[PDB]
């Protein structure tokens, strides 16, 4: 009798989302193992008939064998997450029909998956929203693919200024944020807290212009994106992900820039104890520790600001002590409200969350801001009541390698002479600490001080500043 | 006394659009000449003050000198084009306010510019729409940047099938053609004649997927495009051009794939006869002769089909004998009707044409289809009445190197066994000659026979075909 087990070895089942997800993954491990065992090359595995046979053999091998498949799943925590979706699932329903949901709770030090929600109720709808459904991750792409990489590359600090003035995509359409064609200059923090789009667009433009290897970063974390030239990439255009994959992206940021590959299987043993597969840790430093910890600091304010999510309010009411753990995170909303995301970390754990409809019809405007935030607050609470120390009380903290520059609030760059329409001008004014992940820190102030912006934009902004 | 002259040496003027365009270009030649004459490096020319001085010196040098600046402009033809815009300009006005216009008539063998229209009336509006205004070239980008390059690369023949089924951009928006989300499979000819967008989008996707050096082509013709990853690049997203530059793109196609750099100055001589600048021909084979001549054949049908332009009807009425020259061309329309283009070639000459408003407000829906077509028909007529043999009576003809494959109408690929949902199936049916620019011609028919298309798309199309 083969058995799928929780991480402590309690038996899940002899050989619902949990069963079928872990069994499908075990079948894939068994496939690789049998193929190598029989000396079938990946040249021969190119053959559909050979491949099919080996898939069948893998499945029957588990059925008939006496294998012990040890998963990473924590019984108590995964059972708490099931009861939480059962009990509080209905908080998602927002007047647009029944809302579907996926969640993945991941250990930031190992990438092990401790439990997950695959959906509202397997018995009514079997689609697995944690591992199978691929969806645009919307604005939760920004910290990873735009600002994170900019910061990593010495192209941006914590208090850098970005343009949020009006501007068009290549196709001539305006870049929108709900009904706003935009505003003016803003700090990176404000851009993150509001999730404005134009500042993200300019950041990614800057990366392209500099020929930064964005793919090198994203592929290290296991993302597959077919076109890196897409302008709205940081807003979720041209990227689709499962919740488990995307959680692994936030795991990397939470773990001080060090990726660990997600997994639900830690080991498969034959009846006699032969280890036929075992997870092998392959840690990767995807962002510098300076970058990661700078980003942790920005993402803490995302949640504490409560601009795009009610989550910290919902949590503080449910569980004030837990709300005082060091929560960081980012929300996402797709352009027609088709996908809402909330990704959450403490230094120990990352919990990813998606809601949406299976046929891609729209959620209500506030599904992500309010409903998912409340559901995920109840989820988080449930996890903690199951395993009181699991989230931890550690804080995220800036790595010793972070560089601190004193920069003008108004420019995000150092006080200096700047040439402004003819005149060289002493740019002076009140300053602020800005965090950087390069060697030298922030540049001296320049005329084009901000990330992006047209000539008109700068004339408007300099006029403004020049009122000293 | 310095003098700007027509190509025969008749004096234009001692030292309006014509005057200022040729004088500005002469100033730039004089700038390079004086800088080299004084041994100022391009390192020193990096200095703004040195640069400014040298620009001033160039201008004063012409003023005070005795230089003879010989332009490529044909007096009679350029004077006919002025009278044509004066007399028939008003045909552009379409109920959206006064419409602006730019035209450039180019010799396909030399790239010499024989005359141009800079606008409706210099005296009312000085903007130079032939040489200065940069605008999206819309769907006239397709032959150059999508199908041309696909054909060049052995990825497409004259009767290849493309998908025009419904599909979304990376941002999740549908690809539109006016109010159509699209249709089904279609030939390359139909795609060109209608200017459908989805088939163009898939072609460019295919290029990106294959890592084709699209930039290598476009830069050879002197285009500057900042982001080659833009999905709507073939529809004019992310590209802006002057009329003179874009004419040079159609010159390359008309001249059997061989680029000649556009120019309005052929020579500058000092009073004593010293040749201080002279145009130097640097011909480049940008597309194979097979490709170019295949494309000539497709673009002839664009005009003869009269789907997107009334031009051949307007011309046949004005001048039936001239309408029977071998006209090929492409129209362009931007998404809000802001820019309309019509590019025209005979084997001898290429005439480019743009209309639009200076502040970018919309034209009427039919400004490009009807009004510009009629204006340009009158322009063409005027040019011919000035210089009766200038357009020539030669035909475009397929180069001996073009490969001819007999392919199924339905697939654009060769008759063959194809695996269709289980069954291998004998795909048979009526065939057609398809032109190719590779060594081997069209592949055998495959399941995914068309450029682009989803799994659903192919199921719909194969079902259809399978009705033998
Ligand atoms: B992102 O925050 O997911 C970003 C790309 N989202 C939007 O632009 C969006 C989609 C749908 C409705 C509104 C918005 C803007 C918005 C407004 C308030 C908070 C977050 C996003
Ligand atoms: B192309 O033909 O310039 C292409 C990208 N144009 C359009 O999609 C367009 C823009 C504005 C209005 C309509 C259309 C579609 C269209 C309809 C008939 C003929 C040509 C273009
Ligand atoms: Cl499942
Ligand atoms: Cl489950
Ligand atoms: Cl066996
Ligand atoms: Cl356990
Ligand atoms: Cl996954
Ligand atoms: Cl858009
Ligand atoms: Cl990249
Ligand atoms: Cl992915
Ligand atoms: Cl790329
Ligand atoms: Cl696994
Ligand atoms: Cl996994
Ligand atoms: Cl055994
Ligand atoms: Cl580091
Ligand atoms: Cl808070
Ligand atoms: Cl709140
Ligand atoms: Cl649904
Ligand atoms: Cl609760
Ligand atoms: Cl420091
Ligand atoms: Cl400092
Ligand atoms: Cl540095
Ligand atoms: Cl920038
Ligand atoms: Cl500007
Ligand atoms: Cl001019
Ligand atoms: Cl003129
Ligand atoms: Cl001199
Ligand atoms: Cl002349
Ligand atoms: Cl030009
Ligand atoms: Cl769009
Ligand atoms: Cl390219
Ligand atoms: Cl250009
Ligand atoms: Cl590129
Ligand atoms: Cl020139
Ligand atoms: Cl020129
Ligand atoms: Cl002289
Ligand atoms: Cl050739
Ligand atoms: Cl005709
Ligand atoms: Cl007609
Ligand atoms: Cl105007
Ligand atoms: Cl006429
Ligand atoms: Cl042949
Ligand atoms: Cl053949
Ligand atoms: Cl070949
Ligand atoms: Cl394809
Ligand atoms: Cl499909
Ligand atoms: Na958001
Ligand atoms: Na058109």
mmCIF file of C-alpha atoms and ligand atoms in Angstrom, chain B residues 204 208 211-216 228, ligand 31:
data_model
loop_
_atom_site.group_PDB
_atom_site.id
_atom_site.type_symbol
_atom_site.label_atom_id
_atom_site.label_comp_id
_atom_site.label_asym_id
_atom_site.label_seq_id
_atom_site.Cartn_x
_atom_site.Cartn_y
_atom_site.Cartn_z
ATOM 1 C CA UNK B 204 5.527 39.935 -35.980
ATOM 2 C CA UNK B 208 10.157 37.758 -32.284
ATOM 3 C CA UNK B 211 14.741 35.941 -32.859
ATOM 4 C CA UNK B 212 14.802 37.512 -36.329
ATOM 5 C CA UNK B 213 16.932 40.671 -36.487
ATOM 6 C CA UNK B 214 14.080 43.034 -37.444
ATOM 7 C CA UNK B 215 16.295 46.023 -36.338
ATOM 8 C CA UNK B 216 18.981 45.026 -38.860
ATOM 9 C CA UNK B 228 11.189 46.386 -31.119
HETATM 10 CL CL1 LIG C 31 15.028 43.225 -33.509
#
